[PDB]
Write a protein that binds this ligand. Structure first.
Ligand SMILES: O=C(O)[C@H](Cc1c[nH]c2ccccc12)NC(=O)C(F)(F)C(F)(F)C(F)(F)C(F)(F)C(F)(F)C(F)(F)C(F)(F)C(F)(F)C(F)(F)F
Ligand SMILES: O=C(O)[C@H](Cc1c[nH]c2ccccc12)NC(=O)C(F)(F)C(F)(F)C(F)(F)C(F)(F)C(F)(F)C(F)(F)C(F)(F)C(F)(F)C(F)(F)F
Ligand code: HEM
Ligand code: HEM
Lengths: 452, 452
């Protein structure tokens, strides 16, 4: 007798996801029904998990492996067998995993630091150059930053997002590709002639992304020039197990994948972090005091970024409340029983609803809606599988250290260089595009007039 | 019988200006008809002068004064009794001239230099940051630069044009305002209610310009801060002659007037200069050698800019061939005979066709179409009134030193930092908007990797 939300005859629970904010809907359902609920659609079923008690079993890699949700299957049409949209048992997953992990270590970030600073300084300069009555469109500027950072650090390519209003022909295609994949989740009969125009458009965007990226691949191969970026590492890199390199088609899929995941997740993080800071002035002040104490040079060093302890706590608390990639899907590797109560058969699916996990009162206390970075004073105190904004196990975010170093550097610089004003008393409105962002979030930034 | 071009019945010569390129059309007429021709419209007559021998007489301030051509009378609808669109005998001309002259002096350029460098560096960084496959849209980027420079230097306001594709709402309105002013010149029967829309837009644009500028003026008054800029000088300054300051309305007209000149004339000069440089590689070699030899520091000094003699010569030769404000108008103060042959009545109008003056074979030699900066190696060798890209006498360009300093600095830096390629073998196509620019002029720039 597993709880299940309201049904719509033969459509079962499907129309519940016919909303612009499905994750927030699922969270509300979770509040009503508790740690587990069944979700059915025609010809399919999953179970949404919200408690640490159940999710710690789900995160047992001997019992469950990553499933490609429906959203991911559609993303796969353009991200292919890149790391994010591949099955664990695909040869290209384990090859790419083995090859790329070294280039994504905490220690590899030393090599990317200079290129991260390049983009971060562009952001700071932009804000320094605004006139008095002007304001900042936060998610928009964080996206310019994060896209450009992954473009530069990973492929030595400048999207030059701070020189534009109209973003790159690649990104528009990529955004529109992501849009189309999102929509198909609420679409009876995909072969309907009504959607011929949508299929047409989907195809055009893939060609944009594939042509640009392949071209860069080939230019670099011909060139033979040595950067230390992700692309170089991939061109020369051999998988220790097979002894094979990634082929050029897979390298493309990896590039598209890095560009997608998670420029948008990382910009979300920065946007939510600044949101929580301006809504919690004592926390902002503590974070600003750290930045001023630590960032003593015009150019932040790698070591200095590692010393921004409180800024790191701020980012983790923002990830707790609004994890920007808010769910991931699993399947049972064999018949097993979840929580001593719910029998599952091989192949049965789960969804881990991360925002709800992160609101588990048995783990976090009663005050789960409050923004308190101090929860992360000692991150080791957090029980296993209680905090999972970067997913689980061998299928966890390969970009976690990149994202966190980038976000810490930038937020550090922001807090060093400006005072912030929530001049509209912004009301949180979370836009969902698979990922989460605070739509319409704006601030004013008054320079502290500290030279770069 | 004075030469006169072909006619269109009762419309006389008017429809000859019903073209996108009226100045270039008038130049062809001048080549056919010689040093002087009459041009009639219904209720209007003027005489176009092309030779140094007649133009030198026209430049006698005891015999002729500046006239507001029909184009200027329309621009006056938004530029008012600012310096450019006022009559010499209006009290506000001499008043503003006396007040502003010392702010536009060669010595005053020392004070503006640092903010000119600020925008110049933004241009260079933009080009340094282009990817290998990309090219530069020349007049577009020069206009970003020149507009921003005058904004910053003159009123401490950042248009941030390098952060945009869509220009500032002020610039949008101003360009559209200018365009409308030109369109009134060629349209027959301006009372026709089909132009109700054009009128509506015009007034909206005038409003946008005035409200922005009035706001900045009011804010600087309200704050009372002091900058190294034209606005400061205008709020504090008194005309030594009358002892009167400019009132806030005239101050707004001056600001609008200065913005129009930045936006239009100086960007055109830089664009034509770069055009001639890429069409004349030996000239480019000499300019680039000088820049490398003179600009020995990452941040150019005022003193170094003054040392760029050859770059200066390149700019003057570009001004000889394509003076970007290509015509000015005069009226006879009294009955007088021009050149011993052409009797004029008081009030009779003259037009000086600057590009034709600059192609006067009796002054320059037969090779007048060739680009030869060495024509300007010695200013003293140029006969009186043979070279007039900045107009004449007390009504000459007040901004000449500003424009030449900016252009020399910026061209110097461009040649220091980049090699240039005419990758399309661009065919000169000159767009006319009451100034001249080379439309669609594009190049590629290969960085010399010299740090800023
Ligand atoms: O796609 C699914 O299978 C189910 C919803 C669903 C659709 N049809 C169903 C039928 C039965 C049961 C559930 C469903 N998806 C969700 O619950 C979801 F939360 F919206 C989601 F799709 F998983 C998700 F969170 F948006 C997501 F797609 F996983 C994701 F996290 F956003 C993501 F796409 F994976 C991502 F990680 F954020 C991302 F890839 F980076 C992306 F957002 F795409 F950029
Ligand atoms: O307006 C006139 O009286 C005559 C054309 C004319 C002659 N007879 C006419 C009879 C009826 C109608 C029009 C005419 N004017 C011009 O030919 C002219 F406007 F001076 C011009 F040649 F087009 C000109 F060069 F573009 C110009 F407008 F003078 C000018 F030099 F560009 C200029 F407008 F003054 C300028 F300096 F560039 C400027 F004003 F700064 C501007 F470009 F507008 F920003
Ligand atoms: C705040 C920022 C980010 C968040 C919250 C985030 C979150 C996640 C999550 C939850 C997953 C697991 C998805 C699943 O199980 O289906 C994941 C996977 C992944 N992320 Fe991120 N991510 C972020 C930033 C980045 C960045 C910056 C990159 C790359 C530059 C990146 C690359 C990836 C890749 C490649 C995977 C797939 C890994 C694999 O299965 O082998 N992520 N991320
Ligand atoms: C290459 C750049 C420029 C060229 C070729 C140019 C050309 C001219 C010309 C030909 C005139 C005389 C117009 C007439 O007789 O009707 C003039 C006047 C004027 N210019 Fe410029 N100009 C340039 C740059 C500037 C700049 C940068 C400014 C201001 C920042 C400026 C401000 C003015 C003003 C105010 C007048 C009117 C002066 C008066 O009558 O008192 N100009 N300019």
């Amino acid at each position: 007798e597993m709880p299940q939300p309201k049904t719509f005859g033969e459509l079962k629970n499907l129309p519940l996801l016919n909303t612009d904010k499905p994750v927030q809907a699922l969270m509300k359902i979770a509040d009503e029904l508790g740690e587990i609920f069944k979700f059915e659609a025609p010809g399919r079923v999953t179970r949404y998990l919200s408690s640490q008690r159940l999710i710690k079993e789900a995160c047992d890699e001997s019992r469950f492996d990553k499933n490609l949700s429906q959203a991911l299957k559609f993303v796969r049409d353009f991200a292919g067998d890149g790391l994010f949209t591949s099955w664990t048992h695909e040869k290209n997953w384990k090859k790419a995993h083995n090859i790329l992990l070294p280039s994504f270590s905490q220690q590899a970030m030393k090599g990317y630091h200079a290129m991260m600073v390049d983009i971060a300084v562009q952001l700071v300069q932009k804000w320094e150059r605004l006139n008095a009555d002007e304001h900042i469109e936060v998610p928009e500027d964080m996206t310019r930053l994060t896209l450009d950072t992954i473009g530069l650090c990973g492929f030595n390519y400048r999207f030059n997002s701070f020189y534009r209003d109209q973003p790159h022909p690649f990104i528009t295609s990529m955004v529109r590709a992501l849009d189309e994949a999102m929509n198909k989740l609420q679409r009876a009969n995909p072969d309907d002639p009504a959607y011929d125009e949508n299929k047409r458009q989907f195809q055009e965007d893939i060609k944009v992304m594939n042509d640009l990226v392949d071209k860069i691949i080939a230019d670099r191969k011909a060139s033979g020039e040595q950067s230390d970026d992700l692309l170089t590492h991939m061109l020369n890199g051999k998988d220790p197990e097979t002894g094979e390199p990634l082929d050029d088609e897979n390298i493309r899929y990896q590039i598209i994948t890095f560009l997608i995941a998670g420029h948008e997740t990382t910009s979300g993080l920065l946007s939510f972090a600044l949101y929580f800071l301006v809504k919690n002035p004592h926390v902002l002040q503590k974070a600003a005091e750290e930045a001023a104490r630590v960032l003593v040079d015009p150019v932040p060093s790698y070591k200095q970024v590692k010393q921004l302890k409180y800024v790191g706590m701020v980012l983790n608390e923002a990830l707790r409340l609004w994890p920007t990639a808010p769910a991931f899907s699993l399947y049972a590797k064999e018949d097993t029983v979840l929580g001593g109560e719910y029998p599952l058969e091989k192949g049965d699916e789960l969804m881990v609803l991360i925002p709800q996990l992160h609101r588990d009162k048995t783990i976090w206390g009663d005050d789960v809606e409050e923004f308190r970075p101090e929860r992360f004073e000692n991150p080791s105190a957090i029980p296993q599988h209680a905090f999972k904004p970067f997913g689980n196990g061998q299928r966890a975010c390969i970009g976690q250290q990149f994202a966190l170093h980038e976000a810490t550097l930038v937020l550090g610089m922001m807090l060093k260089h400006f005072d912030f004003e929530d001049h509209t008393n912004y009301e949180l409105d979370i836009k969902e595009t698979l990922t989460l962002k605070p739509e319409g979030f704006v601030v004013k930034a008054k320079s502290k007039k500290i030279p770069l």
